[PDB]
Amino acid sequence: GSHEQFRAALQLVVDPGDPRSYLDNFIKIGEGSTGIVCIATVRSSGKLVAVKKMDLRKQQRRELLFNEVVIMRDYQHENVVEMYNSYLVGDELWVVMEFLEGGALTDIVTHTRMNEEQIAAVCLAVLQALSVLHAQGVIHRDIKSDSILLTHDGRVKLSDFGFCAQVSKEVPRRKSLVGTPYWMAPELISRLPYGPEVDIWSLGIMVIEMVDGEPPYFNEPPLKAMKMIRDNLPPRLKNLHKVSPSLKGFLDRLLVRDPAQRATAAELLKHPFLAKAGPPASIVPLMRQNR
Numbered sequence: 001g002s003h004e005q006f007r008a009a010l011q012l013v014v015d016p017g018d019p020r021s022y023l024d025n026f027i028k029i030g031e032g033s034t035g036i037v038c039i040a041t042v043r044s045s046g047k048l049v050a051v052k053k054m055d056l057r058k059q060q061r062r063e064l065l066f067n068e069v070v071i072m073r074d075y076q077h078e079n080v081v082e083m084y085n086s087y088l089v090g091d092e093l094w095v096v097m098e099f100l101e102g103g104a105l106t107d108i109v110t111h112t113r114m115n116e117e118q119i120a121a122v123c124l125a126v127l128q129a130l131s132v133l134h135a136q137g138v139i140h141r142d143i144k145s146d147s148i149l150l151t152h153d154g155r156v157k158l159s160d161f162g163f164c165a166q167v168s169k170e171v172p173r174r175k176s177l178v179g180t181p182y183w184m185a186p187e188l189i190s191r192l193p194y195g196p197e198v199d200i201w202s203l204g205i206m207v208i209e210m211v212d213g214e215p216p217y218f219n220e221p222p223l224k225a226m227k228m229i230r231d232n233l234p235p236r237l238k239n240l241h242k243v244s245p246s247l248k249g250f251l252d253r254l255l256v257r258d259p260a261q262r263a264t265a266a267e268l269l270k271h272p273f274l275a276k277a278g279p280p281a282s283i284v285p286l287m288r289q290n291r
């Protein structure tokens with residue numbers, strides 16, 4: 001019983017019982033990597049939460065469902081979406097978590113143009129979370145604007161660890177073709193054993209998003225694009241002229257074709273460009289209901 005074995009394994013990691021008993025008023029607010037995301041009210045407290053529901057029978061790699069619940073279950077960090085509980089409901093795994101009322105970064109990078117103070121602020125937060133995460137040996141593996149959620153007061157949180165993986169002192173690196181094509185590191189598309197460095201490349205691609213409004217090759221079909229990324233040199237900004245030398249210098253320590261030469265999260269935190277980072281209040285005017 002393959003399906004049933006997965007259920008039983010999951011029942012060993014999730015909190016027991018039916019969460020529908022204590023949740024009111026479900027409202028769908030998105031699609032995730034592995035399932036859909038709703039918000040609901042906690043009947044007792046009146047609080048709002050977000051709920052990620054993943055169907056066990058609808059997964060390409062069902063084993064990936066252990067990632068968030070095993071790897072992220074206890075995690076806490078100012079810049080990482082906080083998980084509250086997990087449950088098994090019918091054939092679905094549910095993750096109950098913090099609701100980020102500000103929506104995703106994607107909506108901002110496709111509707112406005114961020115200044116450099118705001119860009120560095122997003123970059124600072126993400127890198128802070130990546131430094132701690134990469135230290136514990138957790139690779140996100142799907143960094144992009146969709147994975148960046150905001151609070152009402154413009155605070156930034158890393159999200160959707162549905163594709164994450166674990167590396168250790170005994171086994172660092174993965175050989176897995178995971179992520180979103182346009183944002184994938186070259187050594188990953190080249191099927192090479194890769195480590196945490198693939199997140200830094202991806203953050204670089206997200207910088208291009210914040211500057212150009214889209215990633216490189218975004219018009220090409222995903223299979224073709226991955227090849228162009230695999231074959232060509234580090235991509236160039238369509239708006240290099242709107243960008244300061246500092247941001248360029250920053251970006252250039254991220255889009256290194258050589259993973260060994262690519263900068264690290266811990267390194268990038270000390271970079272001068274991040275001195276431009278503004279307070280979370282600087283982000284607020286970019287959000288939809290304010291613009």
Ligand SMILES: Cc1nc2ccc(C#CC3(O)CCCCC3)cc2n1-c1ncnc(N)n1
Binds near residue numbers: 029103
């Ligand atoms: C809209 C949306 N899509 C999501 C996909 C994955 C995760 C996710 C996730 C996790 O991987 C984070 C780390 C703990 C385990 C769940 C969260 C998503 N949200 C969302 N969530 C909360 N608020 C808002 N506005 N939007």
